[PDB]
Amino acid sequence: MIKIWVHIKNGSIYDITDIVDKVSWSGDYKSPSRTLEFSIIQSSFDNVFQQIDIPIASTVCFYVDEKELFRGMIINRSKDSSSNEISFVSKDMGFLLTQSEVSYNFKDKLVEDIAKQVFAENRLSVGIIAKTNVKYTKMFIGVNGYDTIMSAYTEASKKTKKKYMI
Amino acid sequence: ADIEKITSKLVASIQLAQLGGVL
Amino acid sequence: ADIEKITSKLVASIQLAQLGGVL
Amino acid sequence: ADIEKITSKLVASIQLAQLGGVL
Amino acid sequence: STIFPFIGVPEDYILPKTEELPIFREVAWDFEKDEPILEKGDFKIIEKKEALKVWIYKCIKTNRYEHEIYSLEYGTELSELIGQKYTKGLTESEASRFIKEALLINPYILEVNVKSANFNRDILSANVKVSTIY
Amino acid sequence: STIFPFIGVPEDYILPKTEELPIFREVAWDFEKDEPILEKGDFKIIEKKEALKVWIYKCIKTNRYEHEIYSLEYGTELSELIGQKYTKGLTESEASRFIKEALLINPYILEVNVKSANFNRDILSANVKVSTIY
Amino acid sequence: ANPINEFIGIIREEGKYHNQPSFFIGKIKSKLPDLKIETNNIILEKEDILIDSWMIDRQLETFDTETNQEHQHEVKNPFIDNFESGDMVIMFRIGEKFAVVSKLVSL
Amino acid sequence: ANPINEFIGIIREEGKYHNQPSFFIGKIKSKLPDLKIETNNIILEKEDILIDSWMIDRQLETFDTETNQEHQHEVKNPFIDNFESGDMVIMFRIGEKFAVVSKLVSL
Amino acid sequence: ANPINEFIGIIREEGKYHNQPSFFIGKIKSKLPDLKIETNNIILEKEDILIDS
Amino acid sequence: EANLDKFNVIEKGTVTLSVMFEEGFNIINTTFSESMENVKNKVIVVDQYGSKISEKIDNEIFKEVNVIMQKVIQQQENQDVDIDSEFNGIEKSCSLKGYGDVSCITGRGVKVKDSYTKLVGLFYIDTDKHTWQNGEYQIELELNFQNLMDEKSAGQDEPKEESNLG
């Protein structure tokens, strides 16, 4: 049992499970965001098969066995005239980290505090942050938040013999 | 023309990955 | 060997484009 | 998925060539 | 403080647990006189299959496109067959289709079969079997 | 000028209009005398089916390439059949095709059928059925 | 959009990811004895600054001449220059601290 | 020619398209009061030049000592140096004008 | 390992092959009249040095 | 543009072709796309030192995408930059294959009719390719959407004439 729901800008909510043709869900350890791809059937030749429209930058939710696994924004949209299909590409919220670009001056700071400050500067909600009592000192000029956090946690990993991810 | 389609797909994938952020 | 032929075609196309000038 | 397999083969070939040394 | 990067508000993303359909209940009806039934100075409420009988009776009795209050899917088209507008076989097939499609819109009804069909004089007889979740 | 309606139209956006043809109107014409008709000291205007009759009569009565003012589409080639230049079956086929292709240029005419065809002495008779939007 | 040109542009753009600027430009906020420098919304302290030797050397208040005719003179140094607030400097980044090379003025 | 090696060479070459030189070398044509510098077939005027402060400061003609024994002396500055035509300088490009840092001589 | 990310990393690494450092840091071994400078396990003589005036 | 032995500098879209592409007449296939990847809706200006002086947000683009994607530009002493040029919106494109003439080349404007709504849109040609082989001739175009052509006349230009000539 998989369900897909779409929230449109005006306030309408649709359940589009009966129209979906294919679903894909994937991630990699070298990027902070996960991706979701799906297709629906919409025919312009036939009046019966015309569907609703889902504009760019609307929220899509993915459920499996009554559990929410994905929530993200619609980024790409494509329509082929030969085939009766419309394709969508969605991305997690995690790509918001790489948009930020700030300059910091860190002296003898805990890595957890560094991550907390980076998340707080560009306003973002924090669920939980791994704890490590390793102090770091660095000067960041023109670097992403994602790169800042990853560099600090790599320096912590040089001592904890661990690996970390966002 | 196969090379053109392959290049188009590769370019689209690289652009999506750039938007998503790569470490 | 398909990868070798594809790479050869891609290299030839890129060299021609470099000669023509790319903005 | 063809593009993914082609990219995997290209990446493996490039890594081997990097290890071998390229002038 | 923190931004909400999704369309709407956090309240719209709470999903109520999906449960079985609530027990089907309806006001009792008197088929012989076509009236609702009063009990102890109030309407009498019946449950499960009796309510389904009331709903099926009312659905079969109405015409499909006659009334403005109803949508285009409510009602039956059995009035088009009166007077032998089609041959006997075509009328039989169309009657089966009309009854099935009219009844199947209720989510509490699972399948419908029209099995026996006989023409005697000016009367058409049929047997209908309905399967529900109960 | 902002919307991009090729993938889909926005929900709030309202289509400006639906495209329909105006009511076909034409100066009335009498066929036994081949004149326009004067009514109360002015030209009389009719509409819809009678106007279409006038247009059809005028289109059938003209030759195809004879007049410089007309284009290559307007007219009919029925004058090439006089005198039995072709055989009888070829004549029937050509007459049907000529009439259909000549009449179908009017946007208000939807389909043309030439059903009957008979040879009696030197006269060829046929029945033509024209279907319009009205 | 021709895909080959887009690929070449992508290569040109991604080739510049690791590059760092050659030099930095900074503005002073406090005078030379307690030097403070602002660049890229960052204020540098004395722990973060390496300076040219001549800048320190030229802030000598006074020096004396040799004796002759059984008398001496005291000459005040005219080359002393303490940077004022708002001046511009050219600086190079070495590890974790910046090195101040010279001060630039429009002539 | 193996296509993989050619592709690697193409990447290495196209990655260098946007890079700019770190510094520039220039030759003077007119003396310091009206300074002119030639580099890359381009002659710079005073509108295009930012110079080190010490270069301007050291061209002080004269200074005086303090008084003693009811007399004073005048001392001529020996550090004055006006660049001659044909000298070499090291210069860094900042926006639309060049910054002159130091003059180089073979020792 | 996603091949696209590996390709992007390969491009980023191979784009830096021809680059050279902007400046060098060196420490003196002999006084100014006969100047000697050591950098990157290389000792410079007076034939190899241009100095500020 | 180098035509024959001459060099020219022209502005795109000044010439609009007479031929129009319609679904029922001369189109083999089309593919319409929309993308959000290259959107910019915030501009930050910095001084020569790297310190920030001003910022701006575009509301019309921000309405379409809830997110803020920032851009950083630097002004020198002798330049005063204009912020409003640096904003970028959603990109809408088309890939078309069909029948036409040798007049459809890069740098010209073309018209495509929408089948469902019977609306006409104006596009600029970015890439083109003409092929002759086996006695048939086909074209492939890469189109960039400008705006919807106004029904009848947008400004309703009327020929300004005197009521009486003399």
Q: Is B6 helix (H, G, I), strand (E, B) or coil?
A: helix
A79 contacts in chain J (CB < 8 Å) = 31-33
C20 contacts in chain G (CB < 8 Å) = none
Q: After which residues is chain I broken (C to N over 2.5 A)?
A: none
User: How many CA within 13 A on the CB side of residue F28?
Assistant: 11
Pairwise CA distance, residues A61 & A73, whole Å: 9
Query: Testing the interface with H: which of C8, C9, C13, C23 to mutate, by most H Cβ within 10 A?
Result: C8
Q: Which residues pair with G20 in a beta bridge?
A: none
Contact E76, E100 (CB under 8 A): no
Pairwise CA distance, residues D3 & C22, whole Å: 25
Pairwise CA distance, residues F43 & H36, whole Å: 93
Query: At what resolution in Å was this solved?
Result: 2.9
Pairwise CA distance, residues J116 & E86, whole Å: 38
Give the residue numbers in H contacting D (CB under 8 Å), as ranges: 4-5, 7-9
DSSP 8-state class, residue C5:
H
Pairwise CA distance, residues G58 & J66, whole Å: 58
Q: Is D23 helix (H, G, I), strand (E, B) or coil?
A: coil
CA E11 to chain centroid, in Å, comes to 35
Instruction: Label the pairing between strands J70-74 and J91-98.
Output: unpaired
Q: How many C-beta neighbours within 10 Å does residue E23 have?
A: 10
Closest CA to G48 of G100, G103, G104, G86: G100
Q: Which residues pair with G38 in a beta bridge?
A: G27, G43
Angle between helix axes F49-61 and F88-103 (nearest 10 degrees) is 130
Closest CA to J115 of F10, F110, F2, F9: F9
Residue count (chain F) = 134
**Quick one: which H or E segment has residue B8?**
helix B2-20
Pairwise CA distance, residues A29 & I1, whole Å: 8
Pairwise CA distance, residues A45 & E127, whole Å: 41
Identity of the residue numbered J16: T
Q: Summarize chain G as % helix, strand, coil (round to 5).
A: 20, 40, 40
Query: Testing the interface with I: which of A24, A26, A28 to mutate, by most I Cβ within 10 A?
Result: A28
DSSP 8-state class, residue G17:
S
Residue H75 phi/psi, 5-degree rounding, is -120, 130
Rounded to the nearest 5 degrees, what angle is found at the Cα of F76, between the Cα atoms of F70 and F77?
Answer: 115
Q: Is J37 helix (H, G, I), strand (E, B) or coil?
A: coil
I45 contacts in chain H (CB < 8 Å) = none
CA E9 to chain centroid, in Å, comes to 38
Closest CA to A50 of A40, A58, A60: A40
Show contacts of D9-18: CB within 8 Å, 24+ apart: D9/C3, D10/C3, D10/C7, D10/I3, D10/I7, D11/I3, D11/I6, D11/I7, D11/I10, D13/C3, D13/C7, D13/H4, D14/H4, D14/H7, D14/H8, D14/I10, D15/I10, D17/H4, D17/H5, D17/H8, D18/H8
G7 contacts in chain B (CB < 8 Å) = 7, 10-11
Q: Show Cβ contacts of residue F98 under 8 Å, excluding neighbours closer than 6 positions.
A: F76, F77, F78
Closest CA to F98 of F79, F115, F120: F79
Chain F, nearest residue to A81 by Cα: F7
Pairwise CA distance, residues F9 & G18, whole Å: 44
Chain A, nearest residue to E4 by Cα: A124
Residue G95 phi/psi, 5-degree rounding, is 65, -110
Pairwise CA distance, residues F51 & F55, whole Å: 6
Pairwise CA distance, residues H85 & J103, whole Å: 60
- The answer to whether residue G32 neighbours chain H at the CB level (below 8 Å) is no
Pairwise CA distance, residues H83 & H36, whole Å: 11
Pairwise CA distance, residues H38 & G49, whole Å: 34
Identity of the residue numbered A48: V
What's the CA dihedral at E52, E58, E60, E61 to 10 degrees?
A: 160
Min Cα distance A144 → chain G (Å) is 12
Pairwise CA distance, residues H27 & H22, whole Å: 17
Residue matched to tokens 């029945």: F127
- The answer to whether residue D6 neighbours chain H at the CB level (below 8 Å) is no
Pairwise CA distance, residues J67 & J86, whole Å: 17
**Exposure of J140 by Cβ count < 10 A (0-12 exposed, 13-18 middle, 19+ buried)?**
middle
Q: How far is CA J58 from CA F123, H27, J13, in A?
A: 80, 48, 27
Chain G, nearest residue to J52 by Cα: G41
Contact J111, J151 (CB under 8 A): no
What's the CA dihedral at A129, A134, A137, A143 to 10 degrees?
A: -30
Residue matched to tokens 């030197």: F122
- The answer to whether residue G41 neighbours chain A at the CB level (below 8 Å) is yes
Min Cα distance J131 → chain G (Å) is 16
**Exposure of A140 by Cβ count < 10 A (0-12 exposed, 13-18 middle, 19+ buried)?**
buried
Give the residue numbers in I contacting B (CB under 8 Å), as ranges: 4-5, 7-9
Rounded to the nearest 5 degrees, what angle is found at the Cα of J132, between the Cα atoms of J130 and J138?
Answer: 50
- The answer to whether residue I16 neighbours chain G at the CB level (below 8 Å) is yes
Closest CA to C8 of H4, F65, G70: H4
Contact G37, G27 (CB under 8 A): yes
Q: Show Cβ contacts of residue J48 under 8 Å, excluding neighbours closer than 6 positions.
A: G25, H94, H95, J74, J75, J76, J77
Q: How many C-beta neighbours within 10 Å does residue F17 have?
A: 8
Q: Which residues pair with A87 in a beta bridge?
A: A39, A78
Are J49 and G26 a contacting pair at CB < 8 A? yes
Closest CA to A6 of F11, E122, J89: F11
Chain A, nearest residue to F12 by Cα: A10
Q: Is H107 helix (H, G, I), strand (E, B) or coil?
A: coil
Rounded to the nearest 5 degrees, what angle is found at the Cα of A137, between the Cα atoms of A134 and A142?
Answer: 125
Query: Testing the interface with J: which of F1, F3, F6, F7 to mutate, by most J Cβ within 10 A?
Result: F6
DSSP for G21-36, written as a single string: -S-EEEEEEE-GGG-E
Pairwise CA distance, residues B20 & J37, whole Å: 9
Name the experimental technique: cryo-EM
Token representation of residue E94:
């169309």
Closest CA to J67 of E123, A61, A75: A75
Q: Which residues pair with C1 in a beta bridge?
A: none
H helix intervals, chain A: 111-121, 145-160
DSSP 8-state class, residue A103:
E
Min Cα distance B8 → chain G (Å) is 5
Q: How many C-beta neighbours within 10 Å does residue A53 have?
A: 16
Rounded to the nearest 5 degrees, what angle is found at the Cα of E80, between the Cα atoms of E79 and E85?
Answer: 130
Pairwise CA distance, residues J93 & F7, whole Å: 11
Closest CA to A129 of A117, A143, A140, A145: A117
Q: Which residues pair with G107 in a beta bridge?
A: none
Contact J37, B19 (CB under 8 A): yes
Give a three-class secondary structure readout of chain E: CCCCCCCCCHHHHCCCCCCCCCCCEEECEECCCCEECECCCCECEEECHHHHHHHHHHHHHCECCCCCCCCCCCCECHHHHCCCCCCHHHHHHHHHHHHHHHHCCCCCEEEEEEEEEEEECCEEEEEEEEEECC
Identity of the residue numbered E36: P
Token representation of residue G40:
């890229």
Pairwise CA distance, residues J115 & J24, whole Å: 8
Pairwise CA distance, residues G96 & G47, whole Å: 10
Q: Strand locations in chain C, DSSP E?
A: none
Contact B23, A30 (CB under 8 A): yes
Token representation of residue H34:
């009206």
Q: How far is CA E61 from CA A34, E31, E82, E130, G68, in A?
A: 55, 11, 14, 17, 136
Identity of the residue numbered F76: T
H helix intervals, G42-94: 53-57
Residue H62 phi/psi, 5-degree rounding, is -150, 155
Q: Show Cβ contacts of residue G2 under 8 Å, excluding neighbours closer than 6 positions.
A: J127, J142
